[PDB]
């Protein structure tokens, strides 16, 4: 149905995302159990890690476009990523390595993330009808890898330990690289312009030096999340001032702020919603016991089922508004489940969490899947950078928000933890409802500006 290079990009993306989500699904638990962080520390540290992973994406796009070439930057990113995963596995021998290893994952993603999608864009002549389907399938590839990793990585870490889990993340990256190398010939006429000139070693060294520096800067910021907050606040004011100086930008700015709220809520799945599942949900569904950390796999699960369907079925501000209403309902459902539908021992049916994750995933499909693609319609590289920066700020804020659900390690009674989760989730859902209403009220004006 699709050009041959589509299938290579599909499976490279799948395996890279498998590696990443293998880490994300277990990271907060790893912080608490293996490193002895409190739940607050683990949550803010995860926020900083995720912020760095997403905030640097603009650099790897620049490197792929103008310095080394898309295909070269896929290879370099994949190698740095595999090194990071193996460094994380080694961090169990040498714990002092952990932050450096995570910085290496962050920088790796920053080099890698933009480039397979960029490559995929080039596999179709520019007005090929198959493009839309190709990107829906690309997103499904991302979410199949995420589904497998979030299902299995907690089981693997429980049964064999974290070093094996992280080494398997690295192996997933290695097999992404092997699939690329084996299929290299399929993309021989595909790439950005530097891909087809001989590689500039001057530029290659500038990229390796900048990467190493960035690895150390990321490790430092994740260890010191207070200065990370400071840095991002300063960066945001500066970028907003530059943006305002340079009426479709006003619409791009407002849609970006709404996306910020969405990413704050997305950041709860690996942190507060994960520990909500651990502490206050039954670990049995359809008669099968499961690792409660695996409940995170409900996000890609619902995306995989809903993206074809939802591809089959207003315009921008209203789609964004709908997504915000879905997210509101996800957190109100979590709160309601805890307030009214819990056991006398304090436990809720896991079907409430299946529904929470459905709501959250529909929100994802409406906001972030369909976001900077159509922020690019109001504007270009600068706004791309701003989107990633604001999403990094959102993950830092999300980690901070998650700390309101942190439970001390000596609490053992689910009836003590249930009211904390319900209070926080109910207030998140109400604030998000308010945001959705203000979005709705602005839809006519916003939609006017696009005219």
């Amino acid at each position: 149905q699709q050009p041959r290079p589509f299938f290579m990009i599909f499976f490279v993306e799948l395996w890279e995302r498998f590696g990443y989500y293998g880490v994300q699904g277990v990271l907060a638990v790893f912080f608490v159990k293996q490193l002895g962080f409190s739940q607050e520390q683990a949550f803010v540290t995860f926020g900083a890690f995720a912020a760095l992973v997403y905030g640097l994406i603009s650099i790897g796009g620049y490197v792929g476009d103008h310095l080394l070439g898309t295909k070269r930057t896929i290879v370099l990113g994949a190698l740095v990523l595999a090194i990071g995963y193996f460094m994380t596995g080694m961090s169990l021998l040498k714990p002092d390595l952990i932050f450096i290893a995570l910085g290496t994952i962050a920088v790796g993603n920053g080099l890698f993330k933009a480039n397979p999608a960029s490559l995929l864009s080039k596999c179709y002549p520019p007005k090929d009808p198959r493009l839309d389907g190709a990107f829906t399938l690309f997103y499904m590839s991302i979410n199949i890898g995420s589904l497998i990793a979030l299902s299995l990585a907690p089981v693997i870490a429980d049964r064999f330990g974290y070093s094996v889990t992280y080494n398997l993340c690295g192996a997933g990256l290695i097999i992404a690289l092997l699939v690329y190398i084996a299929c290299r010939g399929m993309v021989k006429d595909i790439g950005s312009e530097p891909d087809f000139r001989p590689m500039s070693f001057s530029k290659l060294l500038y990229v390796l030096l900048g990467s190493v520096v960035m690895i150390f800067v990321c490790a430092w910021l994740m260890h010191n999340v207070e200065v990370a907050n400071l840095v991002l606040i300063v960066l945001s004011i500066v970028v907003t001032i530059i943006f305002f100086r340079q009426n479709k930008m006003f619409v791009a700015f407002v849609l970006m702020l709404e996306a910020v709220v969405f990413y704050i809520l997305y950041a709860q799945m690996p942190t507060s919603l994960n520990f909500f599942a651990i502490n206050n949900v039954h670990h049995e569904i359809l008669g099968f016991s499961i690792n409660p950390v695996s409940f995170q796999a409900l996000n890609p699960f619902w995306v995989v089922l809903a993206s074809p369907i939802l591809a089959g079925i207003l315009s921008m501000p209203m789609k964004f508004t709908l997504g915000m209403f879905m997210c509101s309902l996800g957190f109100l459902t979590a709160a309601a489940a805890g307030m009214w539908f819990a056991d006398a021992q304090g436990l809720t049916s896991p079907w409430f969490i299946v529904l929470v994750y459905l709501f959250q995933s529909l929100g994802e499909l409406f906001i972030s899947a369909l976001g900077l693609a159509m922020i690019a319609a109001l504007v270009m590289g600068f706004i791309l950078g701003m989107w990633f920066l604001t999403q990094a700020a959102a993950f830092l804020l999300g980690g901070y928000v998650a700390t309101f659900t942190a439970v001390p390690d000596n609490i053992t009674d689910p009836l003590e933890t249930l009211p904390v989760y319900t209070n926080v989730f109910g207030k998140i859902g109400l604030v998000t409802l308010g945001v959705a209403v203000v979005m709705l009220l602005m839809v006519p004006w916003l939609k006017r500006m696009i005219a």
């Epitope: 651990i278 502490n279 670990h283 056991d343 390690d409 053992t412 009674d413 689910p414």
Partner: nanobody, 122 residues
Framework: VQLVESGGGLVQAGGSLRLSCAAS????????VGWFRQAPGKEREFVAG???????RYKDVVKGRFTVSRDNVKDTVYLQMNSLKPEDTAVYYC?????????????????WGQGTQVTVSS
Amino acid sequence: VQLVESGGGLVQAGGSLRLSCAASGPTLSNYAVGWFRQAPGKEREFVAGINWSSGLRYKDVVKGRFTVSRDNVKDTVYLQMNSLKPEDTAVYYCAARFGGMLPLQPSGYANWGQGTQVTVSS
């Protein structure tokens, strides 16, 4: 996923016994381990437990007599039963739930040992 209990037996009032729980596959370190007991003609009831991060929970009628503790090297959990009384006579079970919570009812736990008889004679 499967827990082996050991260490039951027969003891006179005021004596002591130690139960131990070990898991074949999953590292027990990630699990809250609760000890339940079923006396003749009654339901399983929570006795005592330790979560994955050394938090402890006890039934009122056993405080000051039973201690739950954990050897994370041997991947083992212990219930030390001192000042035993006839009414501590029961089948004892260890049960394991992932995480930090020790819920009171058997349905909060997915993994169960087979049970060891503890008898305390007057």
